[PDB]
Design goal:
Largest sheet of chain A: none
Distance between the termini of chain B: 53 Å
Bound molecules: ligand 1F5, potassium ion
Oligomer: heterotrimer
Helix content of chain B: over 70%
Shape of chain A: elongated
CATH superfamily of chain B: 14-3-3 domain
Strand content of chain B: under 5%
Entry title: Human 14-3-3 isoform zeta in complex with a diphoyphorylated C-RAF peptide and Cotylenin A
CATH class of chain B: Mainly Alpha
CATH topology of chain B: Delta-Endotoxin, domain 1
Structural class of chain A: little secondary structure
Keywords: 14-3-3 fold, RAF, ALL alpha-helical, adapter protein, protein-protein interaction, peptide binding protein
Chain A: RAF proto-oncogene serine/threonine-protein kinase
Radius of gyration of chain A: 17 Å
Number of helices of chain A: 0
Largest sheet of chain B: none
Shape of chain B: globular
Strand content of chain A: under 5%
Number of helices of chain B: 9
PDB class: peptide binding protein
Assembly: trimeric
Chain lengths: 17, 230, 227
């Protein structure tokens, strides 16, 4: 929950959970 | 007990999002030579789909950059060779899976349901190779993908209910292969529309355990139909 | 030259989300011995934070699973944890050694000296999240890095500078999670936010987005820690 400094259509086939 | 440990590790790897570890564990389970349970083959396919999926996603990003840097010779060449390096990892992962399928999974699959599962997977990983093959190599790879899907399509049509997630998932992917790989939108739409309508006709065949997967894949089938019409 | 294209490659790895390749490129740049530019050190920072971030994330998951299972499923989780810790320590060691050998010695401006000492502080702190002794020595090394960073930035940088603010954000978290002093974490965070709010005219068009983002995070932590 506490933050430190951050980092930073097509066809659908069968998804992957 | 050993296999049960390997499976527990795979689930641990999955929760820690370490998909290389998860795939290594399930490949070891597979190489013990026994038929996988439902959960095991589901884990094996989740793990490998994530591993290959990262390269496919990387490959599309790098291709898009290689195209949009047409005029800048240095930038565009660096992209071409980064792409080629990704393609190599991608083919190795595809070959690893296809080799597990040929050597252990398919020949020992004693139920229509698991035969279709593994042939779908075969149609899938050749599809992934066809995504980055050229140009006379591409032809036999496209053919390998289509045959695997065609056999799985015939078994499932004959042995499985239309609402079965595996039968629906095969239709989904096989329809994607027609659209994307063979540029046949109408065949793709025909395949998906039929699978959707045949499942709609038999909605009393869903069980409490199946339905959420089935209805998800139906929605995906119709999403593609919508997309492919307009 | 070599450097210019290792950097371009780093940027391409980044867009492809291949952060091990990004880190390996930026590590080679660093090892050429020349002072990094701002873009180069930012790329180095992003690459390694992603590489180490994946381990910390996995570590928190596995360790939590282990703590929730009391008595041999527990063992499995423990040994997986330790394997992840080793990866994580190797990564932090790799970075700390780049800082000591190449980066901190060559830094010719206050801005970039503060940046590297903040990194040194952060990577010692990641080693701390996962240490037990040994640990006391590690915490002290993190604290001394952030402290020197914090002294230099107070003297050399505007209160709205993103580096100065981000240093305050991480030093604050260090006080809270590592030294278990909520009050000192809140005071560091509160002062850094208030001093930036009083001087919003010192924002550049180039910097303001970064600055205001870290301001929000500083306050969010303060909210979390008091409410
Ligand atoms: C490792 O298990 C993952 C997956 O396997 C099962 O789902 C399979 C599954 C899915 C679902 C979510 C649509 C996506 C991955 C997986 C494993 C794969 C396939 C589908 C249809 C064919 C499949 O593509 C495999 O192709 C060879 C078939 C085999 C699906 O039944 C299971 O019901 C889901 O319930 C939980 O477990 C499943 O995901 C759950 C966590 C619930 C849905 O979130
Ligand atoms: C590869 O660099 C990424 C990052 O570097 C810069 O941002 C730094 C930065 C951020 C920003 C998004 C808040 C997060 C990572 C990075 C590089 C790091 C740090 C902040 C504050 C101190 C920092 O944690 C490094 O500490 C060692 C300072 C050095 C930030 O200025 C730059 O301005 C951003 O604009 C673009 O580029 C930056 O992100 C952009 C793509 C824009 C914001 O999306
Ligand atoms: K698949
Ligand atoms: K950092």
């Amino acid at each position: 929950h506490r933050y430190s400094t951050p980092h930073a259509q097509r066809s659908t086939s069968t998804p992957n959970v | 007990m050993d296999k049960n440990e390997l499976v527990q590790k795979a689930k641990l790897a999955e929760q820690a999002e370490r998909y290389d570890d998860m795939a290594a564990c399930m490949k070891s389970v597979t190489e013990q030579g026994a038929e996988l349970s439902n959960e095991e083959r589901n884990l094996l396919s989740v793990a490998y789909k994530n591993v290959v999926g990262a390269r496919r996603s990387s490959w599309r990003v790098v291709s898009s950059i290689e195209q949009k840097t047409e005029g800048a010779e240095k930038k565009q060449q660096m992209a071409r060779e980064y792409r080629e390096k990704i393609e190599t990892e991608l083919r190795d992962i595809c070959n690893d899976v296809l080799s597990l399928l040929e050597k252990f999974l398919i020949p020992n699959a004693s139920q229509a349901e698991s035969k279709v599962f593994y042939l779908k997977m075969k149609g899938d990983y050749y599809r992934y190779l066809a995504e980055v093959a050229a140009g006379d190599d591409k032809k036999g790879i496209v053919d390998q993908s289509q045959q695997a899907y065609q056999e799985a399509f015939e078994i499932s049509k004959k042995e499985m209910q239309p609402t079965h997630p595996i039968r629906l998932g095969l239709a989904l992917n096989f329809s994607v292969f027609y659209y994307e790989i063979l540029n046949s939108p109408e065949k793709a739409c025909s395949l998906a529309k039929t699978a959707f309508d045949e499942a709609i006709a038999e909605l009393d065949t869903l069980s409490e355990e199946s339905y959420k997967d089935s209805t998800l894949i139906m929605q995906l089938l119709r999403d593609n139909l919508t997309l492919w019409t307009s």
